[PDB]
Amino acid sequence: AQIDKKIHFIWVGHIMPQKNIQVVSEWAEKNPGYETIIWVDKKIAPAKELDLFILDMKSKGITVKDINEEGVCRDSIRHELDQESPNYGMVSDMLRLNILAAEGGIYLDSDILCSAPFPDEIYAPFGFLLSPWSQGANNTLCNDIILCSKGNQIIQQLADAIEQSYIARDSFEFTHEYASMKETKGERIAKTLGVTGPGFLFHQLKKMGILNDKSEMEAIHWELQDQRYLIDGSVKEPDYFYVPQNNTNDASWVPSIKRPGIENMSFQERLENAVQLIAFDIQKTGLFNLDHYANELKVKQNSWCIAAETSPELKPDSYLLIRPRDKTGEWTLYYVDEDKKLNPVTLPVIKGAIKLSEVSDPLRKFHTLLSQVSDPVNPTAHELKQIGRALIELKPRQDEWHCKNKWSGAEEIAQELWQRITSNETLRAQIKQCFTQFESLKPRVAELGLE
Ligand SMILES: O=c1ccn([C@@H]2O[C@H](COP(=O)(O)OP(=O)(O)O)[C@@H](O)[C@H]2O)c(=O)[nH]1
Numbered sequence: 029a030q031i032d033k034k035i036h037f038i039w040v041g042h043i044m045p046q047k048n049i050q051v052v053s054e055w056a057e058k059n060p061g062y063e064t065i066i067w068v069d070k071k072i073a074p075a076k077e078l079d080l081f082i083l084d085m086k087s088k089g090i091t092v093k094d095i096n097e098e099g100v101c102r103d104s105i106r107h108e109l110d111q112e113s114p115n116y117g118m119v120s121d122m123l124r125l126n127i128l129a130a131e132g133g134i135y136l137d138s139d140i141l142c143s144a145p146f147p148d149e150i151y152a153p154f155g156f157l158l159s160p161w162s163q164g165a166n167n168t169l170c171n172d173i174i175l176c177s178k179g180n181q182i183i184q185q186l187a188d189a190i191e192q193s194y195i196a197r198d199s200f201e202f203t204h205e206y207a208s209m210k211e212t213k214g215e216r217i218a219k220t221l222g223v224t225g226p227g228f229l230f231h232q233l234k235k236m237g238i239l240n241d242k243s244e245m246e247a248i249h250w251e252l253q254d255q256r257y258l259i260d261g262s263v264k265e266p267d268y269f270y271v272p273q274n275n276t277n278d279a280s281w282v283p284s285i286k287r288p289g290i291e292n293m294s295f296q297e298r299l300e301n302a303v304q305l306i307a308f309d310i311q312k313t314g315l316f317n318l319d320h321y322a323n324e325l326k327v328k329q330n331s332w333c334i335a336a337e338t339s340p341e342l343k344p345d346s347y348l349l350i351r352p353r354d355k356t357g358e359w360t361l362y363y364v365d366e367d368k369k370l371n372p373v374t375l376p377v378i379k380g381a382i383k384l385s386e387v388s389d390p391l392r393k394f395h396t397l398l399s400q401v402s403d404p405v406n407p408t409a410h411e412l413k414q415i416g417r418a419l420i421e422l423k424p425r426q427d428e429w430h431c432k433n434k435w436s437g438a439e440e441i442a443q444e445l446w447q448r449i450t451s452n453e454t455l456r457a458q459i460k461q462c463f464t465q466f467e468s469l470k471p472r473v474a475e476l477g478l479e
């Protein structure tokens with residue numbers, strides 16, 4: 029069956045970095061017979077920045093599709109996306125299979141360069157193709173290049189299996205190769221690779237009989253497999269893909285970062301988010317890590333806003349950044365204190381002998397960042413992204429200009445989560461295990477165990 033003439037990229041969370049956009053643009057330009065599509069999630073995205081991004085992509089002739097609008101976001105995927113710190117690797121691993129089932133075509137990571145265009149028609153014997161090449165290595169297994177015909181059954185089976193793998197993530201034991209991988213690569217990377225990544229894929233392909241007994245995790249031996257599953261039906265290096273030695277991959281999902289706007293949400297909003305996520309865990313597995321949710325919820329970074337002028341309503345204990353009326357004018361940063369007083373954050377004009385404190389000053393670094401904005405009246409999505417990032421993490425030496433970020437402790441939050449969950453009679457009855465290391469809550473987990 030013919031591979032549908034679509035090239036699919038995924039970027040969820042904040043806005044796709046410039047480097048990645050350049051890569052996508054190159055793929056689009058070099059493969060004009062294919063529709064190039066960037067997939068996003070509008071539900072967690074920063075709305076203003078995403079709007080700018082979409083308009084930009086339209087101007088470059090790149091289609092943007094939303095995972096929710098197209099119906100490719102399973103509940104399990106929504107579940108990871110709505111976490112306060114999503115594993116975007118897991119999300120992307122799951123989404124690519126659902127997109128391919130729905131539309132067919134070619135999934136690519138945006139950290140692979142195009143060294144040759146695809147054939148105008150690709151005909152796949154089993155409606156499904158993998159690359160023997162990944163991250164500059166030949167005769168390997170990876171999941172960053174996947175081709176199929178719309179509605180392919182292998183792709184559909186993989187999508188179902190990865191959903192089950194993900195749902196079972198908190199029962200995942202670091203054994204076999206993963207015991208080692210935990211030690212070498214760390215817990216986050218090991219678990220990702222095993223649950224949704226090339227580890228998951230390896231085991232699923234073996235179960236399906238697509239890889240035979242001669243194939244091993246770290247020695248796939250494509251030359252001993254059915255090469256009709258491979259692009260161009262061969263283990264030979266494909267012409268299409270290139271990476272330089274000094275950047276074989278981006279590992280962009282590895283940092284654990286809060287999703288957009290967490291720091292600006294109300295406690296009650298965040299709490300209810302956690303409650304719904306826990307409810308899903310309980311319904312699907314009967315098991316939830318209470319500490320995961322509590323340890324996320326306790327984090328309060330700086331609240332912030334970028335506006336044209338004093339917002340119709342001020343947020344107490346936050347930063348408010350005001351753009352100039354003209355492209356030449358200076359920005360104004362305010363610390364909005366707990367009583368909603370605008371405290372202007374300013375710096376003296378310095379020259380002559382350089383003070384080593386001032387070069388290392390958070391506020392001067394911030395000021396420098398603002399000065400490099402091309403058009404203060406019309407900042408780009410990436411500019412807004414960088415300024416927001418700076419504001420979230422800004423820690424002035426002046427206590428008068430420092431956000432207080434007064435917030436509940438993890439244990440108190442966990443107690444509240446426990447009460448709300450266990451007060452639901454249906455949920456209570458569905459709990460089989462609860463992971464907690466909170467001293468006040470271990471007892472309550474024992475109490476329910478008796479019941
Ligand atoms: O903030 C992020 C980081 C990563 N990703 C997704 O994660 C995929 C894999 O990232 P990367 O290629 O950097 O990982 P690596 O190939 O090094 O494992 C990307 O293509 C995106 O779909 C995402 O959506 N948002």
Ligand SMILES: [Mg+2]
Binds near residue numbers: 137138172
């Ligand atoms: Mg990659």
